[PDB]
Amino acid sequence: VDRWIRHAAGVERPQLLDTETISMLTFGSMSERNAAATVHGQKAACELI
Amino acid sequence: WADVRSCIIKALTPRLSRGAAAAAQRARRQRERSAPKPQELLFGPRNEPAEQTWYAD
Protein backbone atom coordinates (compact mmCIF):
# COMPACT_ATOMS: atom_id res chain seq x y z
CA VAL A 1 0.00 0.00 0.00
CA ASP A 2 3.00 2.30 0.45
CA ARG A 3 4.13 1.55 -3.11
CA TRP A 4 0.59 2.21 -4.32
CA ILE A 5 0.49 5.51 -2.40
CA ARG A 6 3.88 6.62 -3.77
CA HIS A 7 2.68 5.80 -7.27
CA ALA A 8 -0.64 7.60 -6.82
CA ALA A 9 0.88 10.75 -5.33
CA GLY A 10 3.78 10.87 -7.79
CA VAL A 11 6.36 11.32 -5.02
CA GLU A 12 9.17 8.77 -5.11
CA ARG A 13 10.34 6.50 -2.32
CA PRO A 14 13.10 7.52 0.09
CA GLN A 15 15.07 4.61 -1.46
CA LEU A 16 16.84 3.72 1.81
CA LEU A 17 18.55 6.77 3.24
CA ASP A 18 21.40 5.65 5.47
CA THR A 19 21.04 6.26 9.20
CA GLU A 20 23.92 8.72 9.12
CA THR A 21 22.04 10.48 6.33
CA ILE A 22 18.98 10.28 8.59
CA SER A 23 20.85 12.09 11.36
CA MET A 24 22.02 14.49 8.64
CA LEU A 25 18.43 15.13 7.58
CA THR A 26 17.27 15.70 11.14
CA PHE A 27 20.29 17.99 11.43
CA GLY A 28 19.22 19.67 8.19
CA SER A 29 19.30 18.92 4.46
CA MET A 30 18.16 20.37 1.14
CA SER A 31 16.45 17.36 -0.39
CA GLU A 32 14.26 18.91 -3.08
CA ARG A 33 16.05 19.96 -6.25
CA ASN A 34 15.14 22.94 -8.38
CA ALA A 35 12.54 22.66 -11.12
CA ALA A 36 13.17 22.81 -14.86
CA ALA A 37 12.21 26.48 -15.23
CA THR A 38 10.33 29.05 -13.18
CA VAL A 39 8.71 32.10 -14.75
CA HIS A 40 6.60 33.38 -11.85
CA GLY A 41 8.77 32.74 -8.81
CA GLN A 42 9.63 30.38 -6.01
CA LYS A 43 6.68 28.30 -4.89
CA ALA A 44 4.90 28.73 -1.57
CA ALA A 45 1.79 27.13 -0.03
CA CYS A 46 0.78 24.94 2.89
CA GLU A 47 -2.22 23.03 4.17
CA LEU A 48 -4.42 22.92 7.26
CA ILE A 49 -7.54 20.85 7.97
CA TRP B 1 17.85 -25.08 61.75
CA ALA B 2 15.34 -23.11 59.71
CA ASP B 3 13.57 -20.11 61.19
CA VAL B 4 10.61 -17.78 60.73
CA ARG B 5 13.33 -15.11 60.48
CA SER B 6 15.39 -16.47 57.60
CA CYS B 7 16.85 -15.23 54.33
CA ILE B 8 13.81 -15.78 52.13
CA ILE B 9 11.40 -14.20 54.62
CA LYS B 10 13.43 -10.99 54.72
CA ALA B 11 13.69 -11.29 50.94
CA LEU B 12 9.95 -11.45 50.33
CA THR B 13 8.87 -9.03 53.07
CA PRO B 14 9.59 -5.95 50.86
CA ARG B 15 7.68 -7.74 48.09
CA LEU B 16 4.50 -7.43 50.14
CA SER B 17 4.54 -3.63 49.95
CA ARG B 18 2.45 -1.43 47.67
CA GLY B 19 5.56 0.10 46.12
CA ALA B 20 6.65 -3.42 45.19
CA ALA B 21 3.62 -3.73 42.91
CA ALA B 22 4.12 -0.20 41.56
CA ALA B 23 7.81 -0.78 40.81
CA ALA B 24 6.94 -4.18 39.34
CA GLN B 25 4.70 -2.43 36.83
CA ARG B 26 7.45 0.17 36.30
CA ALA B 27 10.07 -2.48 35.57
CA ARG B 28 7.69 -4.46 33.36
CA ARG B 29 7.18 -1.40 31.21
CA GLN B 30 10.83 -0.42 31.62
CA ARG B 31 12.81 -3.48 30.50
CA GLU B 32 10.13 -4.36 27.93
CA ARG B 33 10.51 -1.03 26.12
CA SER B 34 11.25 -0.92 22.39
CA ALA B 35 14.47 0.32 20.82
CA PRO B 36 14.37 4.11 20.48
CA LYS B 37 14.17 6.00 17.21
CA PRO B 38 16.82 8.68 16.50
CA GLN B 39 14.25 11.46 17.03
CA GLU B 40 14.16 11.05 20.80
CA LEU B 41 17.91 10.44 20.62
CA LEU B 42 18.18 13.92 19.11
CA PHE B 43 15.49 15.80 21.03
CA GLY B 44 13.75 13.61 23.60
CA PRO B 45 14.77 13.51 27.26
CA ARG B 46 17.28 10.91 28.27
CA ASN B 47 17.04 7.52 29.96
CA GLU B 48 18.58 6.12 33.13
CA PRO B 49 19.39 -1.08 38.19
CA ALA B 50 23.05 -1.04 39.27
CA GLU B 51 23.47 -3.65 42.00
CA GLN B 52 21.18 -6.02 43.86
CA THR B 53 20.29 -6.39 47.53
CA TRP B 54 20.23 -10.10 48.35
CA TYR B 55 19.73 -12.08 51.53
CA ALA B 56 21.54 -15.20 52.54
CA ASP B 57 21.76 -18.17 54.86
The answer, for B38 touching chain A at a CB cutoff of 8 Å, is yes
Whether the CB of A24 is below 8 Å from some CB of chain B: the reply is: no
Q: A3 near A11, Cβ under 8 Å? A: no
DSSP 3-state of A43: coil
Is A19 near chain B, with CB under 8 Å?
yes
Give me the resolution in angstroms, 1 decimal: 4.0
AA identity, residue A17: L
Nearest-neighbour CA in chain B from A23: distance (Å): 7
Please tell me the distance in Å from A13's CA to the nearest CA on chain B.
20
Least Cα distance to A26 among B35, B45, B43 occurs for B43
Q: Say if CB B54 and CB B10 are below 8 A apart.
A: no
What is the distance of C-alpha B23 from the center of its chain? 6
Q: Is A26 on the interface with B (CB under 8 A)?
A: yes
Q: How far is CA A23 from CA B3, B18, B35, B41, B47, in A?
A: 60, 43, 16, 10, 20
**Residue numbers in B near A19 (CB within 8 A):** 38
Query: Rounded CA gap, B6 and B4, in Å?
Result: 6
